Amino acid sequence: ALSAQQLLNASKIDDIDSMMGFERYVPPQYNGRFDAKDIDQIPGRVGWLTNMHATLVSQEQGISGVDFYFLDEEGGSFKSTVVYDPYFFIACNDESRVNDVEELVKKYLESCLKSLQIIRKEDLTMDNHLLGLQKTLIKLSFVNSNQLFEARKLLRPILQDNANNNVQRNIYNKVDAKHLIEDIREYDVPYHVRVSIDKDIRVGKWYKVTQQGFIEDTRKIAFADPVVMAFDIETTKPPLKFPDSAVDQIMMISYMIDGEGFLITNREIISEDIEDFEYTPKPEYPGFFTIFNENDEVALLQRFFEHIRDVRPTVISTFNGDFFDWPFIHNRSKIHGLDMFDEIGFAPDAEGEYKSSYCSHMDCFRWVKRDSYLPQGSQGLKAVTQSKLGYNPIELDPELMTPYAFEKPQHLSEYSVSDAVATYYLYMKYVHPFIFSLCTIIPLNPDETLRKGTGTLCEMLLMVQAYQHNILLPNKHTDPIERFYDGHLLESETYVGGHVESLEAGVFRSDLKNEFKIDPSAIDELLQELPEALKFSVEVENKSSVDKVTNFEEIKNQITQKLLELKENNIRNELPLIYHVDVASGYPNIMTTNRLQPDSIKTCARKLKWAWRGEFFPSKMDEYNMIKRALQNETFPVLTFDELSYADQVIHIKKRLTEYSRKVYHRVKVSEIVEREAIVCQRENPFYVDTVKSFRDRRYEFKGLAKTWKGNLSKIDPSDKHARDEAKKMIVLYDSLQLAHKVILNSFYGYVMRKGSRWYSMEMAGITCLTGATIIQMARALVERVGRPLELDTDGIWCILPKSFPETYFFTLENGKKLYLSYPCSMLNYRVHQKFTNHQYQELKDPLNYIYETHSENTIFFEVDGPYKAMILPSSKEEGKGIKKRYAVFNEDGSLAELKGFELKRRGELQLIKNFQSDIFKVFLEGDTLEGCYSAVASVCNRWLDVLDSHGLMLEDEDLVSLICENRSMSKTLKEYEGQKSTSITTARRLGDFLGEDMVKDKGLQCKYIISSKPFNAPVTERAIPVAIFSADIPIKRSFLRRWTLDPSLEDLDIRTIIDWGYYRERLGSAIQKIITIPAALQGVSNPVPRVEHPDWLKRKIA
DNA sequence: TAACCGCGTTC
DNA sequence: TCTTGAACGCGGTTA
Ligand SMILES: Nc1ncnc2c1ncn2[C@H]1C[C@H](O)[C@@H](COP(=O)(O)OP(=O)(O)OP(=O)(O)O)O1
Ligand SMILES: [Ca+2]
Ligand SMILES: [Ca+2]
Ligand SMILES: [Fe+3]
C-alpha cells in the first residue's frame, strides 16, 4: 500500500507548484475535429514546455500520469497533466494459443491488471520479418506503475519455473498455459520516458494544450526565456580540513538572477557590512551585485528562500552544488528548524542529488564532466572559466577563506561573487542552449538530459526510432557470470581496438630541412590514379561536375609536373610540410558505410573481419572442478558454499583458481587473438544505422560552422578588434557544440558493448575497429613511400612531406566560385573510395512489395589540417620503443596548436614537471638550425636542473612547496584499497592519522604529498609525506615527521632537508631525457644537456 | 625482467 | 540504482 507515500508526495508537489506559479490548467472542451492545421481555433493554452515529471492523480487508488510544466506567451506559467496507462508485453512461444495465455493472465493478474489486448510489432530477431511477418504479443495495461510492478513480481515466478524443469508424476507418460509465456518485454521503460516517446512530446518545443492533447506549434521558433538563477555558497572550515555542515556555518550565498547580482552575508561571521559593488570581468559579463547584509545565519537562509520564492525560477544552476552546496544548505536548514522542502520545494532524490518539481537544477559540473571535452585537470571552475568564458576569475587560497571573513571581508566577498558570475554565464552561454536543445530530441527532462550517461542518451534516441517504426525493443543485455574458451575459465574477453604507432621522434619545423627518400613506384601509382582522383575530388568531395570546371587540365598539369619532378630526384633534403590527416567521424562513418548495426550481425551478406582477444586462466576443466569441490567443503560467514550466491561462489573460485594456476603454470593469465568473421546482412531494418547517420549529420553542421567562422575570422583585418573578437567567440562556441556532440555520437559505437545494452554486439564493435586499422595502415603505406609519417593513432596520421610535394589547388567553376583541393588529402580519399566502399548496401525501394535496390556507399573521408610550424615528439628511455599519444604542435603564428598526453595537461602530476614542460615547448621554436634549436631547449633545461642541484635554495618557500608538490586524486575511499601500496594511499592514511578519520570519509580526496629522503633505501610509497603537515603547529608537526622518517633524532623540520632531492632530480632528468636529449640523439646531434647522462644502451649505440 | 595496477589521458 | 568502447604512458609493486 505504498500509494499512500506516493499520493501524498503528489499533493505536496501540487501545492508547491501552485506557490511557484504552476497551477494545473484544464483546457476548454472541443467537439470539432483534431487537426493541427486549425491550431488557432481549438480551445487551449499555448506554452513552452520546460519540464516534465511522472505523478499520480486522484480521479481529476492513484492514476499514473505526467505533469508538463509550461511557460506561456504572456509572461506567466502553468502546468498540464497527461494520463497514460503504463504497459508491457507478454511474448509467446506459439502464436496459435495466444488467446489461451490471454485467458490465463486475465485471471492470474486480475488483482492488478486493468485491460488486455493482442497487438503486433516487428521483431528483428524473427524469421521473415523483412517480408512483413510480425510477432504477436499480449499488451498488459495498468492503472499506475505500482500495479505494473506487481504484475512483474507475479509473472517472474512463471518465467523462472518455465526455465526450470517439470515435476515427478506418472513416469509412464497439449501444454499448460503457464509454459507458453516465453518472456515479458518492454517492462523496464521509465514511465515518463514511455509517455514522452508514445505521445511525441519533448521539452523545449512549443505546444498548445487542448482537450484532444498537445498540438506542437511549429510556428514558434525561439525558446522562451525562463528566469535563471545561479548560486554559490561559501562556508567556514577548520584549518587544513573540510567543511562540516554540522559545525561550520555558511558565510555567504552569492547568486545571480537573469543578470542581476546578489549577495547574502552572515554578519555573525563577516566582520563588516559590505556595500554594493561591481564585478564585470569582461564587457560581455555584467555583474552589478546588490548585497543583503543579514544578521543571523537563519536570516541568511530565510532571505535566500524568500528571494527564490518571489522571483520564481524554473532553472537553478550551480557548480558541484549537487554534492556540496545543496546538502550544506539543507543541513543548516534542518539544524535551524527550517524544512527546505516546504520553503523552496527542493529535496534530495534517490541518487542523493537535489531536485525540484517546477525548477531544473543544472549542476554545471555535470556538463563539464560529460560534454565540455576538457581534460580532468581543466575541469575545475577556474580552468573551465578561462577555457570557455575567456578570462581569469578571482582566486584565493581556501585555507585563508575562513580567516578572511574577519580580516579582509571585501576581498572574500569578491571571490564568492566571481564564482557566481562564472557559474551563471557559463550556464547561459554553454549549458543552457545545449541541454534544452538536446531535450527537443531526447525524451528526458532537463535534469536527466544533463546527468545521464551518453550511452543512456543514445539508448533513448534509439528507442524513439524503434518505437516509431513499430520495432519491439530487445530486453537489456545480461553477461554470464562464467564463460570458457578451450576449457579455460575466461577472465576477460574483448576485441582489438584502434591501431597506434610511434614512428619518429624529435623536432620537425617548417624552417629546418629534412631528408626524404621518395619511392619512385609510389609516384607512378598516383600518376596513374591522378585523372580519376581529381574527378573524385570534384564530383564526390565537392559535389560538382567536371563539365562546369574550367582549369581541370591546368591543375592536372601542375600536379603531374611536381609528381614527375619528385620521381626523378627521389632523394631530397628539403623543408617539410607538417601535416595532419584524420577521418571525419571515423567509427560512425565506418558503421554507416558498411551498414553496421547489432541487428545486422547474423547476396545480402557482407562478410567483414574482426579480431577477438581473450584472457583466460592456464588451468583446464580438470583443475577447475578440483578447486570447486575444495571450496565446497569449507565454511563461510555460519553458511555453506552451495548456500551462497552464484556470484560469491565464482568470486571464491576465481580467487583460488589464480593461486593454483600460478603454482602449476607459472602464469596467471593467457591472452590469445583469433581472426573472426561475421555476416553483416545488408537488408536489415536500418533503424540503428539511420539513427547514427542522423546524429552524425547533426554534429557535422556545427563542425562546419566552426570551420566557416575560422575562415570568417582570418578574412578580417587585425585592426577591427570588435569584429574579430566576435568571430573568435563563435569559433569557441561552435567548437564546443561539435565537441559536445562528438562523445554522444561515438557512444553509438560504444553502446553495442555497454552493460545492459538493448542492442549488444561484440562482433559489430570489432568489425568497426579492424576496418579502421586497415584503412589507417593503407594511408601510412602511401605516406611512408612519399613522406615520413611521425605518429599514427586509430584514424589519424601526423606526417611531414617534402615542400615540393603537390599541395593545395583551387578549381574554378563557370559560376566564378572556387572548389578547394588538398592533393595529399584527395589522393588518400580516392584510395579510400577504391578499396573500402560498400557495393552491397541495400534499401527498401518499394515497401508495399518488399523490393530492394543495391547501391554503393562510402562516407569515409580523411580531413587535413596544416601545414604546421613545428611538431615535437618525445622518445622512450628504453631502446627502440617509441612514445605514443604525446606531442606538441605549433601554428605558423607561433601559437600552440595541440598539446597531447603530457603531464602538463593531466590532472595532478609532479608540479615541477608540469612547469618544466610548460616552460620548454615554446622554446623548441627558437634557433636557426636544428643544433641551434636544441641549444635553446638546453638552456631552459639547465636552468631547471640548477634549481634541483641547488636543493631549491634559489626559490622562496611558497614557490618551493608549490613546485615540488605532487597532487593525486583517490577515486575510491582508502578502505577500498586494502592490500595495495601507493603514494596516494600512504598520503591519505597519514592525513587521517594527523587530521582525523573524517578526512578520508569521502572518495575523491586529493593527496598532495612530498617524498622524503628518510628512511634511506626504503620504498618510495613509504616516504610520501602529506604537505599539510608543514602548516600545522610545530609540536603536532615534529611528532609525525619523526614518526614518518623513523628518526626520533630529528628536529630540522624545514622542507629543504626532508625532501629526497635526488628523487626529483631523477624525475626531471627522465623528463629531459624523453623530450630533449634522446630525441636529439635520434636526429643525430650530441647531447645538449650533458648533465643528464645518456642511457647505457644509447652510449653504446654512439659507437 | 616482466606482469600488473590506478589514474588519466588519446583516440 | 546506475552504467559508451580500446590503446596507451608512467610511476610503482610484485612474482
Ligand atoms: N569518447 C569516445 N568514446 C567512444 N569512442 C571514441 C571516443 N573517442 C574516440 N572514439 C573512437 C571512435 C572515433 O570514431 C575514433 C576516432 O577518434 P577521433 O578521430 O578523435 O573522433 P572522430 O573521428 O569521430 O571525430 P573527428 O571527426 O573530429 O575526427 O575513436
Ligand atoms: Ca564556490
Ligand atoms: Ca577522426
Ligand atoms: Fe540476409
Residue numbers in the entry: 31 to 90, 112 to 224, 232 to 660, 676 to 710, 720 to 1185
The authors write:
At the eukaryotic replication fork, the family B replicative DNA polymerases epsilon (Pol ε) and delta (Pol δ) synthesize the leading and lagging strand, respectively. The exonuclease domains of family B polymerases have several highly-conserved motifs (named Exo-motifs), which include the catalytic residues (D290, E292, D383 and D477 in yeast Pol ε). The catalytic residues serve as ligands for two metal ions, and substituting both D290 and E292 with alanine abolishes the proofreading function of the polymerase, which in turn increases the in vitro mutation rate by ~100-fold. At present, many structures of family B DNA polymerases with proofreading capacity have been determined, and their overall structures are well conserved, consisting of a thumb, palm, fingers and the exonuclease domain.
The catalytic site of the exonuclease domain is supposed to harbor two metal ions, which are essential for the exonuclease activity. The published Pol ε wild-type exonuclease domain structure, solved by Jain et al., only possesses one metal ion, located at the B-site. Within another project we solved a Pol2CORE structure of a polymerase active site mutant, Pol2CORE M644G, which has an unaffected wild-type exonuclease domain. This structure of the wild-type exonuclease domain, solved at 2.5 Å resolution, contained two Ca2+ ions located at the A- and B-site of the exonuclease site. We used this structure to assess the impact of P301R substitution on the exonuclease domain and will refer to it as wild type for the purpose of exonuclease domain comparison.
